Amino acid sequence: VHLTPVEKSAVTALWGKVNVDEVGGEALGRLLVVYPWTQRFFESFGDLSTPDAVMGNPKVKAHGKKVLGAFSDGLAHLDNLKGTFATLSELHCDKLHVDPENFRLLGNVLVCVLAHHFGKEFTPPVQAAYQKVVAGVANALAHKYH
Amino acid sequence: VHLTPVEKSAVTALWGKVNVDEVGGEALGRLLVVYPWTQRFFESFGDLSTPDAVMGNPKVKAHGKKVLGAFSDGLAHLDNLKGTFATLSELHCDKLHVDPENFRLLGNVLVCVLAHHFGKEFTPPVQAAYQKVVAGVANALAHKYH
Amino acid sequence: VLSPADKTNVKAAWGKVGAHAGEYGAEALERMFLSFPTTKTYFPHFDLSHGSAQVKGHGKKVADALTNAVAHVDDMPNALSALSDLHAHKLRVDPVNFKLLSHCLLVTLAAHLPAEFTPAVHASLDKFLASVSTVLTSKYR
Amino acid sequence: VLSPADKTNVKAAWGKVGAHAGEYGAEALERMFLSFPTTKTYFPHFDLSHGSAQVKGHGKKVADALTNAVAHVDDMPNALSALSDLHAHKLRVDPVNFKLLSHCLLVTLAAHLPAEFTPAVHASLDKFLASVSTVLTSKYR
Ligand code: HEM
Ligand code: HEM
Ligand code: HEM
Ligand code: HEM
Ligand SMILES: *Cc1c(O)cccc1OCc1cccnc1-c1ccnn1C(C)C
């Protein structure tokens, strides 16, 4: 579903306050902790044996930053998520064969992290707008399966 | 969906042997029995209270025939499933709001019914070709969500 | 399947909810209805307006049911049979909707109890809610 | 959560499998590998050619585990703890793959035991395989 203009302003305003060094790493780390099979795609990343080990892993933090940047690209091109994520879709679908349900999971983990950081500022209407974003992103990332 | 020449010939040959009066109704019936929440979408169909009631229900059988006919249309137009199922997708997605996991489930129940009817003739390569087909149909029905 | 550590996390985290149970249950429902509008079709007999007394009251019922589920965490099928009757037999709720409410519950807990919502507790709560969801959507009588 | 009727259906159906359990396990694996080629990524060290003795041997192991699950249907977490360690802790198998194997097992049973594969039994068997899947993909120890 399309974001409304009010929703687009709300998501963008909140996103400007996000800690870009950290939030991506927390989302990726939580994915690896909450859904541990996703660790299979990151065997070269080192120690992922405990929650602390995952969250404090420099490669998880670094790679999370990249994940966050891609979400930032989506927020700047919401009318063209297909185009924006075309390359990433090929990598994740054609090369890595990540099951698409996992893209949905990461999206929702990111939403949980935003709630964690922003508290009562992450209002139900604000969440609803972000659910549209993460759904659009997941869908764009799974495009090669469509 | 892309099938090799031998896959196309294999799926077509099997499909010609399908009992068009029963196979659709058994697939839909089994969906309603195996995944009972799907009954919520069929309140107007009457008695669905037991497996025997579902399988013997005249409306389940009749509607099953229509479902089977859609799969036949899909088989005839494998190169353009998105176009073929455009109006059906609008119905299932925009009007009925059927969660798309259920599309995958019905495709796999159909495959179970084909195995049930054809036995050892439903070989692993034949199944593989049909899994390509039902995945394509499920994806086409879900296109309005993409 | 919850580990012993999972059960300790859920008992601890949900125990910190306390008198805010209904508030959080109501908020999770509101979050679900706004974020995933198709879920509203299960509640045509409810006043779903924002700040509805019926939603606040139902949030309490949902939250109180979870407390019952945590209290009988090793015998949830028996403990929650009435609710399985309701959600699986009567209402025929598509399991996707349970994933949606569970997610909204985690969001609510993360927003309100950020110190408690560690990665490990998040994991355990997600498993607990999935477990409750499986029981409520299964027909086992 | 299996009903008493579900457990009777599973046990009745698995009884008719008999000495063919390994054959069916092998066929389900083969059907999985052909229909869902991404699943082969978990077995890079296996001979996966058609007729592979290794796949036949593995089909027997899988079938034997399911037999053990049938024997311990009310005690699956305890009975299957080593297999959970393997699949959940060590292999980290994505749960979607269990849905694929479970589906291929149903396909195999429908192909071989059509008189046994009633809609009721199909439903019970699907639930049983989902239950086993949940145990093998959870870390609870
Ligand atoms: C849902 C939103 C997701 C976004 C926005 C995203 C974004 C990205 C980006 C930007 C890269 C870097 C590619 C490059 O530098 O060329 C990447 C790599 C990767 N992603 Fe994702 N990703 C997502 C989901 C997933 C999921 C769910 C998984 C696995 C379960 C996954 C596994 C990977 C892997 C394995 C790599 C390559 C890591 C490496 O090079 O060692 N991603 N992703
Ligand atoms: C996956 C492949 C599926 C196919 C090929 C299919 C095909 C069809 C067709 C041809 C119709 C008739 C529409 C018309 O007359 O214009 C229909 C109607 C319908 N389908 Fe499906 N369908 C599928 C999946 C599903 C699923 C999974 C559900 C529910 C869980 C569902 C629920 C319905 C309902 C409720 C109707 C309308 C019945 C009525 O008029 O009362 N369908 N479908
Ligand atoms: C953790 C998940 C859930 C819990 C713990 C839960 C708990 C409850 C409880 C305690 C009730 C009150 C039953 C009574 O009247 O005594 C109830 C009712 C209800 N629940 Fe849920 N529920 C959950 C998920 C869902 C979901 C996902 C839906 C739909 C999307 C749903 C739809 C309903 C409906 C329609 C009622 C109507 C009760 C009435 O007739 O007034 N529930 N639930
Ligand atoms: C009902 C589902 C399943 C059952 C009952 C099952 C059972 C087993 C058993 C009994 C073993 C042998 C343990 C031993 O060596 O003593 C095993 C190994 C294994 N399973 Fe599964 N399994 C299931 C599903 C899966 C799925 C879905 C995958 C991957 C897609 C998978 C991948 C493996 C792998 C890779 C091994 C190790 C093979 C080796 O190195 O020898 N299993 N499984
Ligand atoms: C009962 C069930 C159904 O219907 C589908 C999938 C999984 C199911 O149970 C999993 C299972 C099996 C054995 C022991 N515990 C569990 C489990 C895992 C999470 N919740 N549960 C229930 C408390 C049984």
UniProtKB/Swiss-Prot annotation, chains A, B:
Outcome of mutating C112R: In Indianapolis
Name the chain's protein: Hemoglobin subunit beta
Q: What is the effect of changing M55K?
A: In Matera; unstable
User: What result is annotated for mutating H63Y?
Assistant: In M-Saskatoon; O(2) affinity up
- Result of altering L48P: In Bab-Saadoum; slightly unstable
Upon changing E121G, the result is: In St Francis
> In the UniProt annotation, what is the result of changing L88P?
In Santa Ana; unstable
The Globin domain sits at 2-146
Q: Quick one: effect of changing Y145H? A: In Bethesda; O(2) affinity up
Curated annotation (Swiss-Prot), chains C, D:
Q: Would you tell me the Gene Ontology cellular component terms?
A: blood microparticle; cytosol; endocytic vesicle lumen; extracellular exosome; extracellular region; extracellular space; haptoglobin-hemoglobin complex; hemoglobin complex
Query: Which residues does the annotation say bind O2?
Result: H58
Could you tell me the keywords of this UniProt record? Answer: Acetylation, Disease variant, Glycation, Glycoprotein, Heme, Hereditary hemolytic anemia, Iron, Metal-binding, Oxygen transport, Phosphoprotein, Transport
UniProt-reported outcome of changing G59V = In Tottori; unstable
Q: In which tissues is it expressed?
A: Red blood cells.
Give the positions annotated as glycosylation sites: K7, K16, K40, K61
- Residues the record marks as site: Not glycated: K11, K56, K60, K90, K99
Q: What is the effect of changing D85V?
A: In Inkster; O(2) affinity up
Q: What is the effect of changing D6A?
A: In Sawara; O(2) affinity up
Q: Per UniProt, what does mutating P44L do?
A: In Milledgeville; O(2) affinity up and
Q: Where is the Globin domain?
A: 1-141
Altering A13P: what's the impact? Answer: In Ravenscourt Park; causes alpha-thalassemia
Q: Which residues carry this modification: N6-succinyllysine?
A: K7, K11, K16, K40
Per the UniProt entry, the effect of L125R is: In Plasencia; family with moderate microcytosis and hypochromia
Q: Does the keyword Cell division apply?
A: no
Outcome (variant: H45R): In Fort de France; O(2) affinity up
Which protein family is it in? Belongs to the globin family.
Medical condition linked:
Heinz body anemias: Form of non-spherocytic hemolytic anemia of Dacie type 1. After splenectomy, which has little benefit, basophilic inclusions called Heinz bodies are demonstrable in the erythrocytes. Before splenectomy, diffuse or punctate basophilia may be evident. Most of these cases are probably instances of hemoglobinopathy. The hemoglobin demonstrates heat lability. Heinz bodies are observed also with the Ivemark syndrome (asplenia with cardiovascular anomalies) and with glutathione peroxidase deficiency.
| Extra remark | Gives blood its red color.
Q: What is this protein called?
A: Hemoglobin subunit alpha
- Organism encoding this protein: Homo sapiens
- Give the classification, highest ranks: Eukaryota, Metazoa, Chordata, Craniata, Vertebrata
